[model samples]
Every structure is written in C-alpha cells, then in structure tokens.
Target: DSRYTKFLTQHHDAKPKGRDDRYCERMMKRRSLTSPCKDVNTFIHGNKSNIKAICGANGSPYRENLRMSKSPFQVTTCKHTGGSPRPPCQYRASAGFRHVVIACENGLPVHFDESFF
Candidate 1:
C-alpha cells in the first residue's frame, strides 16, 4: 500500500554512507516534509526484504499495534536542533545499531514507530 511505500521513502536506506545536517535537510526537502522540523526521525540501513520480514511472526514480536525487530539494524537518527518551522529545518545526526519498532500491514512496514539500542 501507499503507507508502506511512503515508509520506505522516508525511513529506509540500505546503502547509507553516513548522515550529516545537510543530508537531513536535503532529505526533508525532497520528501516535502520540512515543516515543524520533524522533531526526531531515523533511517534504517539494510536490505528491504530483511525489514519487511519483521512483519512475519518469526522475525518480530507483537507490541500492541506495532512490531519489534528480532535483530538490531544499522540506523541514522536525526534530531531537530533549531529552525523556523519551515524549509531551513536544522538537525543533529547520529548513527547506531538498534532494534526498531514499526507498524506493519499486509506484510510490509507502514510506519516507523521507534528504535532502541
């Protein structure tokens, strides 16, 4: 569905080199989601199928309306620092290996809920 595609466009990055403030700004701009600075966001780095697999019973555990990955993933997190709530949204970026929490439907990830190291 569109949600899954949108989730992929916004959150998945199988070949991320590294994230910087500029990268965050460009991505937000490209996605047309620059307003309000996004507060916080994360991009997962790995194979698409591996992430999609998390929707399956064997790859993840249920958590209310979400699912937690059975294994951790490489990720880049961006945190809002300062901005005018417009196009020039500022952010600080960091990378880590963490388990992700996501909402799934029809065997695909529809939303990125959270991440934990």
Candidate 2:
C-alpha cells in the first residue's frame, strides 16, 4: 500500500495533474518491493556521488535506508531535464527535501542514524 505511486509523490512542480507521465509512479518504474536502488548506478552514474556531495550527503539516505531506497532516481522521476544538482538542493540542514548524512567508514554501505531538523 506504499509504493511511490501509492504513498509518496514525485516533484511535478506547477504541471497540471492532467499530464499522465508527470505522475511519479507511471514513469520511473518504482517498486514497492523495497529495493529500487540496487541498480541506480548502472542506469546512470558519475552523478550520484557528485549529486550527493552537492546535495550535502556523503551518500544518499534514500540509498542507505530501507524505508526510502526505492523512491526513484530524481532524474528519472521528478524532472527529466538532468540529474540532481550538487552541494545539495537545501540551503539549511533541514530545509527543502530533507536532512540525513552518512559517512563511509569501511567501504560498503554505511547508513547513519536519523535526526530531525
């Protein structure tokens, strides 16, 4: 009951709801099965980390968290123009989209605990 289509929404901006593909669920091929990010780098890369750093993350929380990993790549879902801009989309730690940071310690996945703004 909580797919990207079912629970959350992609950023549609000022576009009319009449536009079908503008809907997050239809275009990005999201899976409620809870692991949409397993192949994100393959679909597109040389971008996630840069976007992450710019987006103020060492790595994406959605990339790390089980609850949010499959929300769809911002490029594939929200805006078809380009990938996420860097230094983060937020000006403050807790502005715009969100706030979560995880630093890599060993090598692989290293998600941090959550904190509110």
Candidate 3:
C-alpha cells in the first residue's frame, strides 16, 4: 500500500539505526503509528523490487505464475511489543528467509499475508 511506502520512506524504515533499541519507540511516535499504538505490525526490510517480488512476479522482473520460492531476497519481520501508546511502542525483532504471501493489485503490494519459514 502507498501508506507503507510512505511510512517506510518518508516516516521510517525498519532498518536499525546503529543498533538503537528504541527504534520502535521513536518510529511509532515519529510516524504517528502510535497515538494508541498499533497492536501488531510488521516491517519488511529489503530492496523494493525484491520485496515486490514476494507477490510473485506481479511487480516486475520475475515472470508471472512462478513459485513463491522463486522470489529473491529475505525480509526482517518486526513484531510489536504491546507497549504504551504515548512514549513506548516497543518491537520484537526476528529474522526469516522464507516465502511471503501478499495481495497485489496493479503490480503493487496491497495486503500482507502469511509467510512460510
């Protein structure tokens, strides 16, 4: 969704900044993904094209009807830690190299779905 793109590029990227543990806290507030804070969310970190390929060839480069494993690159999943809305919306980080399923429309990512780890 454009919202994710906006958040990722304009607001924040999940890429850790100098091993800062307060990434989520700052990100949530700065991006206004807080307020009440989001209960659960995931941020994918990688090249846009590669990440777009997670939807299986709809975006570009990869051919259509290809298998999920055919997609290149792995994304980091950041799980929200259920912190308070105002100052601390913490996140739990995890790594995975697997197939991601997402909804695509007009060669753009729309809704994010399951992943096979």
Candidate 4:
C-alpha cells in the first residue's frame, strides 16, 4: 500500500509544468530518491483514475511484475544533469506522450517501470 503511496507521490501530476531546476529539486526532495541523483524519473500528467485504469480489465500484464497501458499518457521526464549525490541535484525536464509500463498491486500502481512511444 505504501508503494502505491510512493508511486502517487513520485509520479502523479495533474497539472505539470515544464519542470525546471527548482521544480526538480522540490520533487526529488519530496520523495526519498535524492541521494546519488535519480538520474531519470517521470511524472504523469492526468487523473489518478486514468492511470489506475491502466491496471483495470483492459490493461495487459507483462510476465508477473508489470503491466502496459493500452493508451498513451502525457508525461514530464526529468533527467539529472549534474550535481552531487546530495541536494542541489540538477535536472532537465522534457515533455512527451507515451504509453506507460508499471508495476501494480491490489489494482494500484506501485512503480513507474518505463514509457513507450
């Protein structure tokens, strides 16, 4: 259940902007992955139910650890540019619309595995 919480904190963004350094810094700090710089991360811009639906009856399972969304979702990708493993981690943000692959449990997303164009 907490993983779902973490997933929500880390990935969901109903109204996302073109992320800048400050935004990335705040986001990194909000979660627990600041150390060593996460290198790359993504934020999905849509309703939680839309994403939750990816794990619904229509979504397809991948092996036993992941599921793929039937449609693409708008997202903001944050890539670490430079900085120490600690704070002040620099990041560059990019926008994209892509289908997502994720890890789900109890019908909720637990991890943002990847995105496909």
Candidate 5:
C-alpha cells in the first residue's frame, strides 16, 4: 500500500469534469488482476475509528504525532463556541485528533462546524 498515494483537492472550475464516464468505465471494466476487485473510493470518507480499528492502538498516537507539530487531542475541547474552533478562525485537521468548537463553558460542540470529516 505504500505505493498507493492520493491527493484530495476540491476544484469548482469553468471546465467540465474529466473524471466522469471514462473513469467509471475504466474502473468497471478492470480485471481482478489490475485492481483489488472493489471500489477504490470505498474508504474515502472513513475517519479515525476506521483508522484505529484497522491500524491498532499504537497507530492513533503515531499518526497524530506525524500529522502535526501539536496534537489537537492535547488541546482541551471544554472551551469554545459549542466546542468550535477558536475565535480567530484557525485550524488544521488531521486523520486523528479532530476537535469541535463547543460554546464557551458549554458541554456540546459548536452547532455546525465541528466534525473533521
């Protein structure tokens, strides 16, 4: 799997999408020898729980340590607007250690902008 690399980028542009029918056709027509015989996008939306269960306990901390200089897990979430990001509108998301901005002194995360996925 080390050879498998992907970059997810969002682009809403003037041009039409190239990755439409042809891409789907190629995938649908592929032989088992060429692919794993499953949808390539099956795991696209999977989050931390998926990561931990597949990779194990040590995987969580290791992934956190590798993704960012400061782990969001260490940043107490008890404060914030419903547990939203800090007022200045700053955040960097990682595969693990996601946070929701909760209201200051409130228990639940921010009503809208919380989940990392």
Candidate 6:
C-alpha cells in the first residue's frame, strides 16, 4: 500500500544534532537529506512506531491530502543531558520527554513547521 513510513528512515536518518541555525544545513548535506540540496528538510529519530503513533494519539483527528492544510501530531523531542562532558557534544539518549510543535497532512511531517522541539 506504500503508506509512507519508509521515507523516514530510508532518507531522513541523520543523527540528531544541536538545534542551532546550521543544524539542518550541516546534517542535511552530510546525510543526503536531499539531492542538489534545497533550503528544506525534516529528520526523525528513535523508534518508528513510536513516531507514527503520534498522529493517532490523544483523540487527534485525521485528514486527507485532498483537502487539509494542517493536522496535529504528538512528538517527543530530546535534550542531551550532561553526563561526562567528554565529546564535542554528548549527552544521555532521549533525555527529554515532551511535546513538540509539528504540522502534517498525514505521514509527511513538515520541516521547521514552527514546532520541531
């Protein structure tokens, strides 16, 4: 059925980086976020089902691409907690558990859609 989940890991698997201005610019090119590179992209980390279930959580409504502009989805963003301070940037995995701002038509999440973290 090609439900559109493969696109997440197959193409968007860039190791999460610092949420700086150049985050996307640097990671995108290295991970091949897009070919010929443009000023747009999105990356998802952690388990796949955990990510998809977001859109279906908490009585959220669903819409079709044929008509909707935006829909709600639950997201869990992370923060690198200080642990050893040994590497250039290192922290505990999935340190933060909270909601993130996100917009999508269904499975395709938007890049910097005003609510990434």
Q: What is the TM-score of each candidate against the true structure?
A: 0.85, 0.22, 0.58, 0.82, 0.18, 0.39
lDDT of 2 by residue, 24-46 (tens): 32324332211231211111112
Model 1: weakest 10-residue lDDT segment is 57-66
Error of 5 at 34 (Å): 5.7
TM-score of candidate 2 relative to the true fold: 0.22
Poorest stretch of ten by lDDT in candidate 6: 65-74
What ranges in model 5 sit over 4 Å off?
Answer: 1-17, 27-36, 40-117
45-104: candidate 1 lDDT, tens digit per residue: 889998988899636566568889888888888777765666478777777888888888
Report how far off residue 75 is in candidate 4 (Å): 0.4
For residue 11, model 3's alpha carbon misses the true position, in angstroms, by 11
Worst 10 residues of 5 by lDDT: 3-12
Residue 66, candidate 3: how far off, in angstroms? 14
Off by over 4 Å in 6: 1-6, 10-15, 66-117
TM-score of 1: 0.85
Instruction: Sort the predicted structures by lDDT, highest score first.
Output: 4, 1, 3, 6, 2, 5
- Per-model lDDT: 0.78, 0.28, 0.50, 0.79, 0.23, 0.38
Q: How many pairs of residues in model 6 come into backbone collision?
A: 1
Q: Candidate 4's residue-wise lDDT over 18-99, tens digit each? A: 4566676677767766777887888898799999988897478877778888898888778787656766677777777887
Q: What's the C-alpha lDDT at position 42 in model 1?
A: 87
- Residue 104's C-alpha lDDT in candidate 6? 43
Regions more than 4 Å wrong, model 4: 19-23, 30-36, 115-117
Clashing pairs in 1: none
- lDDT, residue 69, model 3: 32
Which consecutive 10 residues in model 3 have the weakest lDDT in total? 58-67
